[PDB]
Design a protein around this ligand. Structure first.
Ligand SMILES: COc1nccnc1CC(C)C
Length: 149
């Protein structure tokens, strides 16, 4: 009834560690598209990220493992789930484990373009909360996004 597959833009991101989300850090992500293939139990993700100031396109394949949990390799291991959805937004949560074993909790509010409504935003905060991340580690990331469409 509400196809989650489509164009998605990163509006906000929660994070247990502000350094992982900083300018050029591995988590300053900017989504572009998300293909869910419930058939093969996977998920295609096309998204940009900066390094030294230049954009980098990434097209990752997520694997659906037992539960609402998908798997993807990037910056270390990653585990995420759509903690919630509405027609207008997509709030994700991902447990990253870095190439040094550091644990990090993030929340990511996804939507179609710049128009986020208070309902979804209020929701995201709640889930960031429920995930144990400071309400204060959320930051606007779309304004940063200078990567290609
Ligand atoms: C490719 O996407 C991902 N890969 C690993 C973990 N989380 C995501 C979701 C984004 C929106 C932060």
């Amino acid at each position: 009834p509400f196809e989650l597959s489509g164009k998605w833009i990163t509006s906000y991101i929660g994070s247990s560690d502000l350094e992982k989300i900083g300018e050029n850090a591995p988590f300053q992500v900017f989504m572009r598209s998300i293909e869910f293939d419930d058939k093969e139990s996977k998920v295609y993700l096309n998204f940009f990220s900066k390094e030294n100031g230049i954009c980098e396109e990434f097209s990752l394949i997520g694997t659906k493992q037992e539960g609402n949990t998908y798997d993807v390799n990037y910056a270390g291991n990653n585990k995420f789930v759509v903690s919630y959805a509405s027609e207008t937004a997509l709030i994700i949560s991902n447990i990253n484990v870095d190439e040094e074993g550091d644990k990090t909790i993030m929340t990511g509010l996804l939507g179609k373009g710049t128009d986020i409504e208070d309902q979804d935003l209020e929701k995201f905060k709640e889930v960031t909360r429920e995930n144990g991340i400071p309400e204060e580690n959320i930051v606007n990331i779309i304004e940063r996004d200078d990567c290609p469409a």
